């Protein structure tokens, strides 16, 4: 029964490690603004979200380069012990700069504008910052790949299933996190948060070390990224170890898998910069009421229970749709190629802007006829509509279901077109290009930003009464047609290229 035993317990391993490791990172992020302007730093509001903007970033930018440092001679288990072991060090290390023994200690006293580094303790936490995103960004990489490995032959359609469980997991974690570690750090003290995020970090340390004698590994590849630059520059340059036909294989293989990732980087895009103006939309109805009641205990809103909000809509839909799409898709032999299971994909998302568009229209109409209301989510007092968040729902379900058929053929496809080497590697290259359309759509928000721009109401005091979203809502419409559109030529093309 050893092999069962292992395969399904190694599995769940990784499925678990994941889930504790997603929540951690979430549970970080989803108040490391409010971290920042707490009390103990005196951090000013745009170095908060120029922090949390370059942490995602970095970490985003930093997984191929964790992956590519696993895959040419680490190893993918000894590189996830190791990404596992900074990125407790990090959290424990942020920990004690809670505690005023460890703040002191660790970077000077607190001080008696800009880039000039006079929020206190700059360097430290910048630093900080960095290692536990490249331990994040690591672990996330080389885990997907530890468990491809792992839901490797035994089945391709349950290569499939572990996807998409992988990202119910994922989304499990999140849930529980945002609730959780939100609730704990705007309600109690930041210590306890940080606290059961590291206790869970090391925990699954721990169950990541206990599962050694289940997990399987491979040895180590080759290939160096020199060598890959080398030849793609041969490949390319004009008059201005394994062997090398492996090398020129894997060369070949990238030069596929690259421009179906480099036309993805837009949908990322415009997905990220979606979640964003959908959290910044959803913020400015009329959220429901606990006991709070603000009037002018278990105050101040989390801020973040609209994103658990979304990442709910998410996971509930990710069983129901394996369990029925799936069999009916096989059964009515209709299949698409993953490529336009990414183009359907593309598709919703395009619908659920719409309906966004359409529905901020009639919000914009209604603040038109003066019916503001106030309410008061985090530290930030907000007019709102005579809207409910009710109808947010339908557009949530819509997008969930959109990245849904967008994310799990899109890790499917790059794992299994892969090579074996550079299966990680690739995933990193992945996520670097998710994380560059991230970047490229914050930068495009902040051109935006402008004066005389569609959004540039700074007298709102950061509220979208005055601004005009539609017409940015409908811009990301079009993107996302351009995308979709040019994602089409790039399939047609991969699969002319596979058929060769």
């Keep these: 029964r050893g092999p069962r035993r292992w395969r399904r317990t190694a599995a769940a391993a990784v499925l678990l490690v994941q889930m504790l490791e997603r929540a951690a990172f979430f549970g970080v992020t989803s108040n490391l603004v409010l971290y920042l302007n707490s009390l103990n730093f005196n951090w000013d509001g745009q170095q908060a979200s120029r922090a949390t903007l370059l942490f995602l970033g970095a970490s985003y930018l930093l997984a191929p380069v964790g992956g590519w440092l696993a895959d040419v001679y680490l190893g993918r288990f000894l590189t996830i012990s190791l990404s596992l072991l900074l990125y407790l060090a990090a959290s424990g290390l942020l920990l004690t700069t809670i505690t005023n023994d460890g703040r002191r200690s660790f970077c000077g006293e607190m001080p008696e504008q800009g880039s000039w580094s006079s929020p206190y303790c700059a360097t430290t936490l910048y630093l900080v910052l960095l290692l536990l995103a490249l ?175 979304n990442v709910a809509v998410i996971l509930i839909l990710i069983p129901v749709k394996d369990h029925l799409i799936d069999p009916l898709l096989l059964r009515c032999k209709l299949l698409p190629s993953s490529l336009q299971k990414m183009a359907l994909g593309m598709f919703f998302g395009f619908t659920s802007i719409i309906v966004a568009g359409v529905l901020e229209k009639e919000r914009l109409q209604y603040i038109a006829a003066n019916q503001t209301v106030p309410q008061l989510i985090g530290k930030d007092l907000y007019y709102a509509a005579p809207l409910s968040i009710w109808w947010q729902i339908p557009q949530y379900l819509l997008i969930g279901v959109s990245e849904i058929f967008a994310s799990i053929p899109g890790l499917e496809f790059a794992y299994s077109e892969a090579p074996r080497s550079m299966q990680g590697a690739i995933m990193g290259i992945f996520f670097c290009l998710s994380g560059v359309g991230s970047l490229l759509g914050s930068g495009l928000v902040a051109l935006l930003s402008f004066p005389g721009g569609w959004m540039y109401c700074p007298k709102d005091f950061g509220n979208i009464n005055n601004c005009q979203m539609d017409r940015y809502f409908f811009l990301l419409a079009g993107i996302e047609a351009v995308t979709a559109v040019l994602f089409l030529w790039i399939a047609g093309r991969y699969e002319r290229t596979r058929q060769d």
Aim: charge should be positive.
């Design 135 to 309: 331990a994040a960004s690591s672990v996330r990489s080389t885990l997907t790949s530890f468990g491809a490995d792992q839901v490797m032959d035994l089945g391709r359609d349950a290569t499939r299933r572990f996807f998409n469980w992988f990202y119910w997991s994922i989304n499990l974690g999140a849930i529980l996190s945002l609730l959780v570690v939100a609730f704990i750090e705007q309600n109690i003290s930041f210590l306890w948060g940080y606290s059961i995020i590291v206790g869970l970090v090391g925990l699954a340390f721990f169950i990541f070390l206990f599962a050694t004698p289940v997990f399987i590994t491979k040895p180590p590849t080759g290939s160096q990224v020199s060598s890959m630059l080398k030849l793609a520059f041969q490949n390319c340059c004009p008059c201005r170890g394994p062997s090398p036909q492996e090398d020129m294989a894997n060369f070949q293989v990238l030069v596929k898998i690259l421009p179906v990732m480099v036309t993805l980087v837009p949908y990322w895009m415009v997905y990220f910069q979606m979640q964003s103006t959908y959290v910044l939309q959803g913020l400015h109805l009329h959220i429901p009421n606990i006991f709070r009641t603000n009037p002018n205990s278990n105050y101040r809103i989390p801020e973040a229970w609209l994103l658990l909000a």
